[PDB]
Structure formats: structure tokens, C-alpha cells
């Protein structure tokens, strides 16, 4: 996308979202990141939405194929699961590469840095979902370390109702439950996050209240499933 203007890439990312063309969306936003400028709040959301949808479809397909493969145990199901897996890993590596070159290092404000570190934890988590053995351990630790740094910044720099702080805590709790085999840590984190947000709702306008309570309901939904 090197020959397209940054503003045109952003505009086309928005059109691609409206058209539900998420692969195109992600390609436009990769091009925008590669222009080398920092991303605004809205532009960070476009980057995240694009890749979440792309990798979300890959993850759903991988789970379908992995389930069929487990039931079977010719080479076709394994071969095709491996093909989808390699594609998924490539998307995760692409996102991680954008974060490392150079989104995180240029992000000084807490909101941007936390947003990118949450992404980093998420894409290492998606790598961990398909990893095996003694590559899986290092991938898990990379996810944990990214989430932990984001958590440390968010607790110092953002109110407990901030939607990025809340979503980070939600996703880190999912990491603890599903990846790290730490369901008690997952439940603790979700409970403390929910309670501290509850106690800060009084400070919020109606619109901020709506966003924060929506994520708090997702924390509660997990707590209900886990307890």
C-alpha cells in the first residue's frame, strides 16, 4: 500500500468495515501503520477491529478442524488444520511485527501504550492457543509479560472504569483461565476489576457509563460461567 496516501488508506479501512471486508480492512490499516506516523485513538480501533475479525475467523476455523481431527484420532484433516494454523500464525506474526516496528516504542501516552500492549498480549495468546510443548511455554510467557506491563501502566494511569483498562483485565482473565491454567487468578482478577469499576461509575457521564457497564457485564458473564 506504499503508493496510497495515509488518509486514503484510513478512509478505505472505514469503507471496508462497512462492507464487512475485514481482510481488506486489515491490509489498509497495515499500510497506514507502515507510513510511520503514530495512530490516533480512532485509527487504533480500526487496526484492532480489522485484525480481530481476520484472526477470529481463522481461530473459529481452526477449532472446527481441530475438533474433527481429534475425533479421527488419511492425512487430509491434519494437513488442512495445519494449513489454517500456519495462516493464523502468519497473521499473528504480522500484527506483532507492526507492534514491534514501531507502534509500541513510539507510544508514550498511557492510553496508546496500554492499547498496544493489550494487543500484544492478545496475539501471543492466539499463538498460544495453537502452540504445543516447549515453544508453547515461551509464547505463554510473552503473552503474560505484555498483559502484565499493560496492567501495571493502566492501574497507575487510568481510572478503573476506562474501557481499555477494563477490556485488558477481561482479556488477561481469559488468558489466566484458558491458557495459563490459573482459573483462581482469572476469577480473582475479574472480581476485583468488576468491583473497582462499580465503585467508580458515579464519576461517569451517561455515555461513559454505558461503555463501562457493557464491559463489566462481560466480566460478570465470565464469572457466572466460571463459578
Amino acid at each position: 500500500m506504499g503508493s496510497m496516501e495515509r488518509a486514503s488508506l484510513i478512509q478505505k479501512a472505514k469503507l471496508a468495515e462497512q462492507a464487512e471486508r475485514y481482510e481488506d480492512m486489515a491490509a489498509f490499516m497495515k499500510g497506514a501503520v507502515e507510513k510511520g506516523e503514530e495512530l490516533s485513538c480512532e485509527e487504533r480501533n480500526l487496526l484492532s477491529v480489522a485484525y480481530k475479525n481476520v484472526v477470529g475467523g481463522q481461530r473459529a476455523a481452526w477449532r472446527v478442524l481441530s475438533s474433527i481431527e481429534q475425533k479421527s484420532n488419511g492425512p487430509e484433516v491434519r494437513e488442512y488444520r495445519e494449513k489454517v494454523e500456519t495462516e493464523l500464525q502468519g497473521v499473528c506474526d504480522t500484527v506483532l511485527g507492526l507492534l514491534d516496528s514501531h507502534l509500541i516504542k513510539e507510544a508514550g501516552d498511557a492510553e496508546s501504550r496500554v492499547f498496544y500492549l493489550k494487543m500484544k498480549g492478545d496475539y501471543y495468546r492466539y499463538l498460544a492457543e495453537v502452540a504445543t510443548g516447549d515453544d508453547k511455554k515461551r509464547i505463554i510467557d510473552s503473552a503474560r509479560s505484555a498483559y502484565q506491563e499493560a496492567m501495571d501502566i493502566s492501574k497507575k494511569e487510568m481510572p478503573p472504569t476506562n474501557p481499555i483498562r477494563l477490556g485488558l483485565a477481561l482479556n488477561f482473565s481469559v488468558f489466566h483461565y484458558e491458557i495459563a491454567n490459573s482459573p483462581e487468578e482469572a476469577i480473582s482478577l475479574a472480581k476485583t476489576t468488576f468491583d473497582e469499576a462499580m465503585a467508580d461509575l458515579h464519576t461517569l457521564s451517561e455515555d461513559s457509563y454505558k461503555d463501562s457497564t457493557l464491559i463489566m457485564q462481560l466480566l460478570r458473564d465470565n464469572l457466572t460461567l466460571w463459578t
Partner: peptide, 9 residues
């Protein structure tokens, strides 16, 4: 369980 859906701007 459920992570941030984050599939719509």
C-alpha cells in the same frame, strides 16, 4: 470464556 468482542468499530 468471552474476551472483548471488538469486531465492530
Amino acid at each position: 470464556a468471552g474476551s472483548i468482542p471488538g469486531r465492530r468499530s
